[PDB]
Every structure is written in C-alpha cells, then in structure tokens.
Point group: C2
Chain length 267, copies 2
C-alpha cells in the first residue's frame, strides 16, 4: 500500500549506535523508510516526512522545528524541543515529577541542595551535615557535555572541587541498586544497573510512572532512574530522566522502535 | 507636537495604587495619554498604543501579547511575559542572578534546599542541621497569591506545617536588615526595610547590580531584595526579585515613571 518516511536528525555518534542496518531493514520491510535529514540544508526544503525523530540542540535547529511544526501540524515531531527543555533544569524537571498523581508501592522525590557559587561551596554550614555519598549534577545542562552526567561524591574534599552552580542529593537510602527504565511511547523496558561500581519494582507500578512521565513531560523517548528506599522497602524515588537514550544497547530494540514508528505514522 | 498613548492592563487594585490622578496629569502635561486596556475586548481591536504596560497573568493575556508583539514589533511591551516568567521558579531566577559578571563590595547568591513532598518535609535528615530563622517560598509561584510571598520560619515545628514543594534559605548572616531596591529602567531607588518585625550598600554597586539584572532578566520594572553578609561586612546577597512592585509607596514615583514612559516612547 502507501510508504511512510521517517526523517531522522541525529549526531553521527547517535546515527552509528541507533540507525543500524537491522533497524533500517525491519522498518523498510513494513513500509517505513528511515531517511536522514541533511544538516547542511534547511529542513523546510527537505522532502515529505510522516514522522521526524531527532536529538539535536541549539536555537537554529529549534527555529527549523518551530517552522516545521507551524507548516505541518499533523506530522509528529519526536520529540518537540519545548518538551525536551523540561529536562534541562534538574529542579524544574523534578517539579514535573512532583505533579504526577499516586496502591502497595509509594512514589517519592528526593530533596536537593542548590549551591550557586564557589564561596557557598566552601562556607555553607549545612553542607557539613550531609551524609555521603552524594549525587551531584549541574543545575542546567542539555546532556551533550560529559560534565552534564550525574556524578558521585564520596567526601567533603571531592564536593569542594566541583563546579557550581550544582544540585546535591544524598545517596544512602537505596541499598546500592538503581533501576534504569527505558520508555518508548506506551512501552516500558527495565535494567537493574548496580550503582557505586536484585529485586526489581513491580511492573504495574513502573508502567503507571512511565505513563505519567510521558503525559507530564510530553516525551515519547526517555529513560528514568529509580531507587528503592530500603528503610520501608515498598517506597521508590525517581532520581533522573534522560531524552532519547542508548536504546541500541537493549536486545530487541529494533522491533520495539519499528512498532513505535508504525503507531506514530497511524496517530 | 504629537501625543503618545500609554496603554495599561492592570488589575483593579494595581490601577487604584499605581494609576493615580497625579501620575495621569503629569504624563498628560508632557504629551502622554495613559489609556486603560479593556479586559472584556481583545487587545488586537484596541486602538493605537506607543507603549503597553501590564501586570496580568495567564495564557489568554499571554496569547494577546504574543500576537501584539508579532503585529507591532516596534511598540515596547513592559514587560514581555517570557521575561516575567524568569521570576516564577525561585531556583531558575537565582540561576539568572548567578550569570551576572562581577571592586570593594562582593556579590553572592544564597544556597537553597528544595523539598518536593510531605514525606521529605518530615524525614529529610539534613533539615535537622538548619539554622533558624529560614526564608521559605513555594518553588513555583507568579506573586498573585498571598501564599506566594517569602515567609519566615522560626523552628522545626513551623517548617513542618508548610506546603511543599518549597525552597528554604537560612536567614542568620544579615544582622536583621534587608534592602529593597526599586528599579525603573536605568533608574534605581532603595528602602532600608528592617526584616524580622542602618548602613545602606554603596550606590555605585547597587546600580551595577540593578543594571545587570535588567539586562539578564529583560525587565524594566522590578524590585530586588538584598542583604549584607555581616561576617565580612563588604559582601551582599540578592535573595529575591519581584515584577512591577508598589512604586506608588515611594514619594516622587510619578516623576520617575513619567520620565521612564517618555524615554520608552523615544527608543
Ligand atoms: Cl542508541
Ligand atoms: Cl503601585
């Protein structure tokens, strides 16, 4: 019958990991043509698309997506740059998680300390009452930098050498395990990574959170970090959310994505 | 010669305090007609304006200002709603203050604790090492609510009864004085309010900060709260910023505003 064009605008490293022959071939076998977006030409002069997927940042790419969205309201963008932006301030991101509605399993948000300058990082009294280890992230980051990754701190001296502005979370109530939950539209997958280089949370609970994050963030492609609060044992916290992660690591990612692409071009 | 129309879109209480006969008459004496915007009609069908000043919130008023700004790019809006929004998240607001560049007087940003839910407000260990009193604000607020005001907390029991999500700042290093600095474009005024119901900071320093906030926030009308860190005695912190404050309280506000309106319609 008819064919659907899936335009992709990805950095070369993300093309190499995500746009694999096995994905291109599975999708073509179902009538879907994955077509790269030329970065050296405007998207406006670039050919019919039934779906645009991207992981590019900055005001020129944003402007192109803003114009594309005006010219072609019915063509889904995954994901809209105003929705990716909701992840860029750690404090406003966790604010979005705090808006979700709430069985046997409970859902929390971990308190944060924000330190804006070097003087505060030396002299703020409260920092001497922190339990270690800490999770530290820059307050604002898009993920593109290596220094935008959540990093562990083991003592006051290590904290003292970080670059403010930063957000600090205590990291002691979780029994040294982290659950990375991969989401693709209505579909969840879950990876029992072990932090500080086990029993998974209930699947129905994870699906409720995954779906609430999708509706609240307006993102189809993301992965959320979750911990068990092992004081109580049936309490869980979301500690991070990341746009369009390394799906290529999960075996069977090609089938999950192809199913998602097919769903999106029949919305 | 020609006359200039200054449209104003204000709540009735703000009309009563700010749009006083003495302001209307001074401005008319200089060729400037202050004209109220009809809230029951679209702004698009509302008459030539050489300047629009407002203090209204919400998506309908925003949409009207977005359309006005497209149709009439050369007519200044004071202030643009995307710029007022920069004040609505306390953490991203202080992030904007942290971006300013930096003599005898130094300039800091106070560390904050963010508490997202009721469980954290009871159980977060770090809160038992806070010094009191604290400044507490909701993480997100526009100022229109009575509960959106920065409030003082004197002990753990009082902290325990607040409504998260909230931002906590220790409030002990300032020797019980707060400086409210009123800004109108390039012009500063300064009020030695005494907190917890004196020597002012140097005027050149205040003007540098006022001007950096104006460029960074893109606001003409605001007031910033500043404290002296009395450990060192030549260090100052910005602890709050508010859109379009009670200028009518300062004597001589009519002359300051009329001069600002005249400057804006000759940009
Ligand atoms: Cl990938
Ligand atoms: Cl007023």
């Amino acid at each position: 019958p008819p064919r659907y064009v899936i335009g992709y605008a990805l950095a070369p490293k993300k093309q190499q990991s995500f746009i694999q022959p096995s994905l291109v071939a599975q999708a073509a076998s179902r009538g879907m043509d994955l077509v790269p977006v030329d970065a050296s030409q405007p998207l406006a002069e670039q050919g019919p698309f039934h779906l645009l997927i991207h992981k590019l940042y900055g005001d020129d790419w944003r402007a192109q997506l803003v114009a594309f969205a005006a010219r072609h309201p019915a063509v889904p963008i995954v994901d809209p740059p105003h929705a990716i932006d909701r992840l860029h301030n750690r404090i406003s991101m966790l604010q979005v998680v705090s808006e979700l509605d709430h069985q046997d399993s409970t859902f929390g948000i971990p308190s944060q300390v924000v330190v804006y300058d070097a003087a505060a990082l030396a002299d703020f009294g409260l920092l001497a009452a922190l339990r270690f280890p800490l999770i530290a992230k820059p307050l604002v980051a898009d993920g593109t930098a290596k220094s935008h990754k959540m990093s562990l701190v083991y003592h006051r001296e290590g904290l003292g050498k970080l670059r403010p502005p930063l957000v600090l979370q205590e990291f002691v109530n979780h029994g040294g395990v982290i659950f990375k939950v991969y989401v693709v539209g209505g579909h969840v997958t879950c990876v029992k990574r072990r932090s500080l280089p086990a029993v998974v949370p209930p699947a129905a609970f994870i699906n409720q959170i995954a779906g609430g994050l999708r509706r609240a963030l307006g993102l189809q492609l993301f992965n959320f970090d979750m911990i068990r609060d092992v004081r109580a044992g049936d309490r869980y916290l979301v500690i991070d959310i990341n746009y369009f992660p390394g799906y290529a690591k999960m075996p069977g990612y090609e089938t999950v994505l192809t199913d998602f692409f097919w769903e999106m071009v029949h919305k």
